[PDB]
Write a protein that binds this ligand. Structure first.
Ligand SMILES: CC(C)c1c(OC#CC2CC2)c2cc(F)ccc2[nH]c1=O
Lengths: 535, 404
């Protein structure tokens, strides 16, 4: 090829590889000899000699049955400089525009079609062994991008970009996507028009040394892309298959849970509670755990759900972008982004984020932000939101929370259950309501404590606890206060953590205790918590 | 010509990842870049360049402006030991800021340093390779820039500094703060006089009052009232050790209704008066240390209100203040915040000539997803995300506000 090479250097003052050539048989050698004489002429490699101290181990494998070759650059690579990341962020189906026609050119010997930085070449040197360590073996080096070498992919795609700059400009109404060795080409032109242009493109590549065929290996829609089958008009989800057996190992159960978990995003209703259950106290990946009835059941409900065809639409820039969210239980949320009703671009759910202590509004908030970021990426725009929370709820919460928070343009949609505040600590002491002066004290070392209260009304109590901690007592104090009082209470404490609840008013925590206190808080009609300095 | 700039001993170029940008943000950046490309200020680069710095587009204007986050690069850029801070800037009736950022494109950047200025324009849904470029000229947002361009800068300025020696001119990054005691008209007429001058190639510091802490007063006090008072004062004692809550805390002996009224003993009443006296002025012995990081903490007070303190040592504040949302930010915390951050940082610059390190009462994800949409300053301070201690807020919420 006549494409300008990319200047490549080795990592900080290191040196090219000098690993010794693995010994092979007269058979594997004669093969590598054959292959290499070809590459030698195709221009991919060059016979070198004793001027070179570098070397990489060449191997000989038969694929599915002619003798092929494999060079191991593990070393060369770990010595090769760093390059700017290669597409780690790939497109996501729901971000594609629909097209009249879409073609996928399979750029052949991509790598070996691009010139290697002549300077660097020397390091790629390798050697074909002699019949059981005889006289010197055959010596070569690469003159093009080597299959398996660190800098290749990164260098190849650039080359592909430089080479498409003209055509692209010249064909605005034509959109290409480079990925690995494939070129995805779509357009809204007429099928013949398309065909013509494709061929014009195809030829354009050749003008630089890019073989890309047609006729034999030629790919044909739909197109497989990370779990989806893509059609120009729409996309559909690769139907997922759950094997039926009478012997399930741990390995089996985890991988299964894995595939199910992936299915949860697209498919509605997938559950694995009982499946996960089977992993409890497993002693070995190969262990055979019998599925309980419950497991055998859901495993069955999932097989049925997964035999449903989930198809989708592509992004239309001229239509609104909408996202609706559902709170499927505590800490679990489902969302689906669409433009025209029921024709979803994408869907998905967020696992029950078991935090130390939050509330549903906050959690709703987070789901909103995760989505927003996703969208910004997929569509470079953010959706108008449809949220199961009254605008009044929102306003009340947010406008008083100690932490900065927000929700882009959104609208209420009443699709129960709605998210709400489970309680609200009073703003001012409750006149009338009983006042409980609480206190918990525990020996952190002996883990022995007590907790109790004394109300202005004369009521009192104390409890002794074993295997506890100070914070726990403090909380248990508050717990009993809530337990023993009417629907309206005043509780004063010197607990710094209670000062936290006051500021965040959490409706879920990591601690069962805090949890319990919550359940109580939720139960009173009015509660006013007051913190006072200890001692 | 080009001066040989380098990185601090053994430091490597940034390699920060580009954050996702909006469609409108990208479209403008591409436009902006193709021009600069043509104009020779920047040049596309290869994959052999592994560095990267974030970029984004900001807007007072409606044309979009390009903004690069050189925070990492700057920190790694060698030092040049610029302009000593003019203690007088703070004492001016009115200051105006100007963006002399455009002046740098003029000077070339040491060829061997360019690679480190690499930045990338993303593509929606990653359907296109990012557009890699690197600088050929002095980059806006880089520290090395105002420096290298100092000689040229001062040079051009003198003629004005002399025609107007009552005016103060300070340069931070791409900005220029002009401070004079003239009256609004005569001031802004004199600034435009300065703009004009610059082209051929509204703060009010003296009003920033130090605000005190006012303790509530009442006809009658309740168990709760006193309790709240004691809590604040006790905390507050971490600043003024003279503050005392012994007499008061005595009134708190007994299991009585929070709502009950307690009569204040004269002992207690003195104690309170004694405390009001203490809080009547900033704590002594607090001085700014130039060889110490400047810190700014912010608390969300609610109803659109925010409080802050700029200090270097815990409880030894250099300045404290409040911030009320600006018309329009009504339903957006993030806007108020970024707006707030920008404000404080300018005062910071204006006073000590350096940006503080922030502690923001917001979650990292939330901030990072939206702060850019409301950013307007050419610079970008450093920040950390925190949880506001319930008391720190309560104390400063107590600050004094005008009569009317
Ligand atoms: C040119 C690119 C961005 C493009 C497509 O190529 C592609 C691709 C990678 C799989 C994502 C594409 C492919 C389809 F199968 C359907 C719609 C499409 N719409 C498009 O705009």
């Amino acid at each position: 090829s006549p494409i300008e090479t990319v200047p490549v250097k080795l990592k900080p003052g290191m040196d090219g590889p000098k690993v010794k050539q693995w010994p092979l048989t007269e058979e594997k050698i004669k093969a590598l000899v054959e292959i290499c004489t070809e590459m030698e002429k195709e221009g991919k490699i060059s016979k070198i000699g004793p001027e070179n101290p570098y070397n990489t181990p060449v191997f000989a494998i038969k694929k599915k049955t002619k003798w092929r070759k494999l060079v191991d650059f593990r070393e060369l690579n770990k010595r090769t400089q760093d390059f700017w990341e290669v597409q780690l962020g790939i497109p996501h189906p729901a971000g594609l525009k629909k097209k009249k026609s879409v073609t996928v050119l399979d750029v052949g010997d991509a790598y070996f079609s691009v010139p290697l930085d002549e300077d660097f070449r020397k390091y790629t040197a390798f050697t074909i062994p002699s019949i059981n360590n005889e006289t010197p073996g055959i010596r070569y080096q690469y003159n093009v991008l080597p299959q398996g070498w660190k800098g290749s992919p990164a260098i190849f795609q650039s080359s592909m970009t430089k080479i498409l700059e003209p055509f692209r400009k010249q064909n605005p109404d034509i959109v290409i996507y480079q990925y690995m060795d494939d070129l995805y080409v779509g357009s809204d032109l007429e099928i013949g028009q398309h065909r013509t242009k494709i061929e014009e493109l195809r030829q354009h590549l050749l003008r630089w040394g890019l073989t890309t065929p047609d006729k034999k290996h030629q790919k044909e829609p739909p197109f497989l892309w990370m779990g989806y089958e893509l059609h120009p008009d729409k996309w559909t989800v690769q139907p997922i298959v759950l094997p039926e057996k009478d012997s399930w190992t741990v390995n089996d159960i985890q991988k299964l849970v894995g595939k199910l978990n992936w299915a949860s995003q697209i498919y509605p209703g997938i559950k694995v509670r009982q499946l996960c259950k089977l992993l409890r106290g497993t002693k070995a990946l190969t262990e055979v755990i019998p599925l309980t009835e419950e497991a055998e059941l859901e495993l069955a409900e999932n097989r049925e759900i997964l035999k449903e065809p989930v198809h989708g639409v592509y992004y239309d820039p001229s239509k609104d972008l909408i996202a609706e969210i559902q709170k499927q239980g505590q800490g679990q949320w489902t969302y689906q982004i669409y433009q025209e009703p029921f024709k979803n671009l994408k869907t998905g759910k967020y696992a029950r984020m078991r935090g130390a202590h939050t509330n549903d509004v906050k959690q709703l908030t987070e789901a909103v932000q995760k989505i927003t970021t996703e969208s910004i990426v997929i569509w470079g725009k953010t959706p108008k939101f449809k949220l199961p929370i009254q605008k009044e709820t929102w306003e009340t919460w947010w406008t008083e929370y100690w932490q900065a928070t927000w929700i882009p343009e959104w609208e209420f949609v009443n699709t129960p259950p709605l998210v709400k505040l489970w309680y609200q600590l009073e703003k001012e002491p409750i006149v009338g309501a009983e006042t409980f002066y609480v206190d918990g004290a525990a020996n952190r070392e002996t883990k022995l404590g007590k907790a109790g209260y004394v109300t202005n009304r004369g009521r009192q109590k104390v409890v002794t606890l074993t295997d506890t901690t100070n914070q726990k007592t403090e909380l248990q104090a508050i717990y009993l206060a809530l337990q023993d009082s009417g629907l309206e209470v005043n509780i004063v404490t010197d607990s710094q953590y209670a000062l936290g609840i006051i500021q965040a008013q959490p409706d879920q925590s990591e601690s069962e205790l805090v949890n319990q206190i919550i359940e109580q808080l939720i139960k009173k009609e009015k509660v006013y918590l007051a913190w006072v300095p200890a001692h | 010509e080009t001066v040989p700039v380098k990185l601090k001993p053994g430091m490597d170029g940034p390699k920060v990842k580009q954050w996702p940008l909006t469609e409108e943000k990208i479209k403008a950046l591409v436009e902006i870049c193709t021009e600069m490309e043509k104009e020779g200020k920047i040049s596309k680069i290869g994959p052999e360049n592994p560095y990267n710095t974030p970029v984004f587009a900001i807007k007072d204007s409606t044309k979009w402006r390009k903004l690069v986050d050189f925070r990492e690069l700057n920190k790694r850029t060698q030092d040049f030991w610029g302009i000593p801070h003019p203690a007088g800037l703070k004492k001016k009736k009115s200051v105006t800021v100007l963006d002399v950022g455009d002046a740098y494109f003029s000077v070339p950047l040491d060829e061997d340093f360019r690679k480190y200025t690499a930045f990338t324009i993303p593509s929606i849904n990653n359907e296109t390779p990012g557009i890699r470029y690197q600088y050929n000229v002095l980059p806006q947002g880089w520290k090395g820039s105002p420096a290298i361009f100092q000689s040229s800068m001062t040079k051009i300025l003198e003629p004005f500094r002399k025609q107007n020696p009552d005016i103060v001119i300070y340069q931070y990054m791409d900005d220029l703060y002009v401070g004079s005691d003239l009256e609004i008209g005569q001031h802004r007429t004199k600034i435009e006089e300065l703009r004009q001058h610059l082209l051929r190639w509204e703060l009010h510091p003296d009003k920033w009052t130090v605000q005190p802490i006012v303790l509530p007063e009442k006809d009658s006090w309740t168990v709760n009232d006193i309790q709240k008072l004691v809590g604040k004062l006790n905390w507050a004692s971490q600043i003024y050790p003279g503050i005392k809550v012994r007499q008061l805390c005595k009134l708190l002996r007994g299991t009585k209704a929070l709502t009950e009224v307690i009569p204040l003993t004269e002992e207690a009443e003195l104690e309170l008066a004694e405390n009001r006296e203490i809080l009547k002025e900033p704590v002594h012995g607090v001085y700014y240390d130039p060889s110490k990081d400047l810190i700014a903490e912010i608390q969300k007070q609610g109803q659109g209100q925010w409080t802050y303190q700029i200090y270097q040592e815990p409880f030894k504040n250099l300045k404290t203040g409040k911030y009320a949302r600006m018309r329009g930010a009504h339903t957006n915390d993030v806007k108020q915040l970024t707006e707030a951050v920008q404000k404080i940082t300018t005062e910071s610059i204006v006073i000590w000539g350096k940006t503080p390190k922030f502690k923001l009462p917001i979650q990292k994800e939330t901030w990072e997803t939206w702060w850019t949409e409301y950013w307007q300053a050419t610079w970008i301070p450093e920040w950390e995300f925190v949880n506001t201690p319930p008391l720190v807020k309560l104390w400063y919420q107590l600050e004094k506000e005008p009569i009317v």
